[PDB]
Amino acid sequence: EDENILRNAVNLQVLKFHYPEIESIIDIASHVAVYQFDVGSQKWLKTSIEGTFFLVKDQRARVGYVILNRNSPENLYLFINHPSNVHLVDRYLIHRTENQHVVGLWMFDPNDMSRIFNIVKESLLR
């Protein structure tokens, strides 16, 4: 349990100031850049959101993530509703939301990507 308290130290209080519904941080990845797939244009666009990625669970045990944006106060907080909508494709984590609304995550450390992929799947395991 020590490693969980270590990652929640400071960070959880920070995330709860913005999103008090967040119950705990599950994992962290440094320097994650966010991309958005423009369906209809069939092109990826690099967004302005870049920062620490926190995999979190809410007060109802729903899994999601926050990217605490270094570039503006506008962060990104999404839920991962179905584990099969998260795919590890090449060097990226691809997150699909049902209506062809797709985001791409690039994590600075390749080991965080594959660990976070697994932790997403197991945090959603029923």
Binding site: V10, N11, L15, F17, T52, R70
Partner: protein, 230 residues
Amino acid sequence: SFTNATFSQVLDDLSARFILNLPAEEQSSVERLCFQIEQAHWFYEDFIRAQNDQLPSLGLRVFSAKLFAHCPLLWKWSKVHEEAFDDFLRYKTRIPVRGAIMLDMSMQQCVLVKGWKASSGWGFPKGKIDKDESDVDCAIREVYEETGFDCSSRINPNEFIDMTIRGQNVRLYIIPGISLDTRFESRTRKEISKIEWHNLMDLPTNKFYMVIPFLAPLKKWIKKRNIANN
């Protein structure tokens, strides 16, 4: 928003957002930590203090010392390397600079200023803020001193590109519809030799080193304005 945060909660946020969660190699570098501290100070001054004027204005060095206290892993280590932090951050901050991006009616041309030298690059008309004036009044004054044009009746306080590079904050107000036949002249500046229109699509995306960072946000702004006008 940060309107209801305590100062300690603000520093906690900035610590988590910029320094606490860094990879080990970046976190153990005085230089790399300082680049994070500089961006945290920018975020604090330009976003957070805007939502809570009761938060104190802090100098880059005073800010760095306070922030370190909110990164458990680094306060004691930052004290041991105090001289290195003092040294790295000394002279990094600059007096804010304000000016304008003056566009013609079609938004295809912009006014740029340059010195007489071959090495001198083109830049937007601008200068250092005085202790009294508002950001808007600084831009009006600067544009007048460097181009002879009074933009007071046209400047829009909500339409600007505010760019910070390291410690130099540059806020340029976007002012479209300036007549192409405006008679520009350097009123009290020896360093301003040329005041000329430049066609935006001719500029590189180097004599335009200072201008290039503003071109992407400016083009996005123009694109949005052209769509809104139509």
